[PDB]
Design a protein around this motif. Structure first.
Motif, PDB file in Angstrom:
ATOM      1  N   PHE B  24       0.633  -1.298   0.064  1.00  0.00           N
ATOM      2  CA  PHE B  24      -0.301  -0.377  -0.485  1.00  0.00           C
ATOM      3  C   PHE B  24       0.767   0.767  -0.255  1.00  0.00           C
ATOM      4  O   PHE B  24       2.226   1.038   0.178  1.00  0.00           O
ATOM      5  N   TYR B  25       0.360   2.007   0.336  1.00  0.00           N
ATOM      6  CA  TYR B  25       0.924   3.879  -0.500  1.00  0.00           C
ATOM      7  C   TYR B  25       0.188   4.391   0.387  1.00  0.00           C
ATOM      8  O   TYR B  25      -1.314   4.615   0.971  1.00  0.00           O
ATOM      9  N   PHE B  26       1.001   5.193   1.150  1.00  0.00           N
ATOM     10  CA  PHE B  26       1.198   6.692   1.964  1.00  0.00           C
ATOM     11  C   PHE B  26       1.352   7.235   0.810  1.00  0.00           C
ATOM     12  O   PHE B  26       1.891   7.470   0.607  1.00  0.00           O
ATOM     13  N   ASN B  50       7.916  -6.282  12.544  1.00  0.00           N
ATOM     14  CA  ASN B  50       9.252  -6.317  12.098  1.00  0.00           C
ATOM     15  C   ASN B  50       9.290  -6.787   9.930  1.00  0.00           C
ATOM     16  O   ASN B  50       9.808  -6.883   9.649  1.00  0.00           O
ATOM     17  N   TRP B  51       7.865  -7.402   9.632  1.00  0.00           N
ATOM     18  CA  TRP B  51       7.171  -7.897   8.759  1.00  0.00           C
ATOM     19  C   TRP B  51       6.995  -6.552   8.305  1.00  0.00           C
ATOM     20  O   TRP B  51       6.591  -7.175   6.834  1.00  0.00           O
ATOM     21  N   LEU B  52       7.208  -5.259   8.702  1.00  0.00           N
ATOM     22  CA  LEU B  52       7.079  -4.362   7.451  1.00  0.00           C
ATOM     23  C   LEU B  52       7.991  -3.333   6.914  1.00  0.00           C
ATOM     24  O   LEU B  52       8.593  -3.492   7.774  1.00  0.00           O
ATOM     25  N   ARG B  72       4.083   9.705  -3.222  1.00  0.00           N
ATOM     26  CA  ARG B  72       3.911   8.173  -3.058  1.00  0.00           C
ATOM     27  C   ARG B  72       4.860   7.748  -2.267  1.00  0.00           C
ATOM     28  O   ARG B  72       5.580   6.515  -2.850  1.00  0.00           O
ATOM     29  N   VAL B  73       4.786   6.751  -0.495  1.00  0.00           N
ATOM     30  CA  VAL B  73       5.821   6.029   0.065  1.00  0.00           C
ATOM     31  C   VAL B  73       5.100   4.393   0.229  1.00  0.00           C
ATOM     32  O   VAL B  73       4.176   4.042   0.329  1.00  0.00           O
ATOM     33  N   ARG B  74       5.690   3.637  -0.661  1.00  0.00           N
ATOM     34  CA  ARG B  74       5.610   2.298  -0.654  1.00  0.00           C
ATOM     35  C   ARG B  74       5.708   1.547   0.148  1.00  0.00           C
ATOM     36  O   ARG B  74       7.041   1.574   0.205  1.00  0.00           O
TER      37      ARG B  74
END
Ligand SMILES: [Ca+2]
Ligand SMILES: [Ca+2]
Ligand SMILES: [Ca+2]
Ligand SMILES: [Ca+2]
Ligand SMILES: [Ca+2]
Ligand SMILES: [Ca+2]
Ligand SMILES: [Ca+2]
Lengths: 201, 193
Positions: B24-26, B50-52, B72-74
């Motif tokens: 997802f994106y911010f 830790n999995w993100l 747009r931060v993935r």
């Protein structure tokens, strides 16, 4: 030279007929006559109905001059499939059909019935599964779905001779069951199928 | 001079399935046109996921975060296959926060985002197979079970290959997904006599 044919045909039967439930098989009778011509045959239960509707043969070349000489016998191809569900009793020496055959020449001489025996057995008697390549699992007592898929694929890959219609199942601890199309089975114990991944790296 | 922090848009429906990669994106904007960095946290405390992971491409560049073209931060990751799922699914989620700042150091408030997570069977919905015709509906043969399984698999290339399809005596199909959740296909969608 004798004015008439008074001698019936001579039949050679196969000596060891073995059939597996659900699998097509075939065997041959060989027939000669002093005239060189066989008219037809009869498969029976010592003169009573054969009672095996799944057994068939072709009447190709019956009652043709020269079709049944010593040099070129009449070869009768008998074929069929023992039913998938044919009962096999506890004493497998009883899993057989004893039947009779006789033949006519073109002069009306018929041979005396002689016996032949169709033994039949479960498919598990025909197949001997090889052990799969080992599948390495996280927990020997609780395989994951992907590990069970891998075990089944490995068992299948180690045994292309086994029928495709056989069904391979895998228990929680990796014990393999192969269920042949006639519902007879084979087992592979888990210690021949899976090993602990962490123990093995 | 810049006295106003960046503003952050978060996705409204982040829904992840156990064992399956999500992304997802911010989207971040600043009146200066430039966002310097972000921070993901649990309301200021350590994020604890830790999995993100997220990409830091194009951080702290002029023009990287305008109204027309926001930053747009993935973000991506995989919820663990064995993440427990509470009986109350309103609790099967992680509530976290993001903040961002511009080159002058104006920091936004913590903005909430929620990662919902669900069992694999909540994603997958098996399509029905071509029907297999059987000799007895209460007692399938080995060959018929093989045919049922192949038909379910052929109709559902989207279900994980690692899922296992089993077939009961009456043609009921069970699909067990890699995370051990399941689906069932009732016999009447599967076999006929
Ligand atoms: Ca004769
Ligand atoms: Ca065997
Ligand atoms: Ca600003
Ligand atoms: Ca840009
Ligand atoms: Ca489902
Ligand atoms: Ca759903
Ligand atoms: Ca299978």
């Amino acid at each position: 030279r004798r004015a008439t044919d008074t001698t019936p045909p001579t039949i050679t039967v196969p000596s060891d007929i073995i059939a597996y439930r659900g699998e097509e098989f075939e065997f041959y009778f060989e027939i000669t006559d002093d005239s060189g011509q066989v008219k037809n045959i009869e498969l029976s239960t010592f003169g009573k109905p054969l009672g095996l509707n799944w057994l068939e043969y072709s009447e190709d070349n019956f009652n043709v001059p020269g079709n049944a000489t010593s040099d070129n016998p009449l070869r009768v191809r008998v074929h069929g499939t023992v039913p998938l569900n044919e009962p096999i009793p506890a004493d497998k020496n009883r899993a057989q059909f004893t039947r009779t055959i006789r033949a006519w020449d073109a002069a009306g001489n018929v041979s005396s019935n002689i016996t032949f025996v169709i033994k039949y057995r479960a498919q598990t008697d025909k197949y001997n599964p090889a052990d799969p390549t080992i599948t390495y699992v996280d927990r020997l007592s609780s395989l994951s779905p992907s590990e069970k898929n891998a075990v089944e694929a490995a068992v299948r890959a180690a045994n292309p001779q086994i029928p495709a219609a056989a069904r391979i199942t895998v228990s929680a601890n990796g014990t393999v069951t192969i269920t042949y199309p006639d519902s007879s089975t084979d087992t592979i114990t888990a210690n021949r199928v899976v090993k602990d991944l962490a123990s093995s790296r």
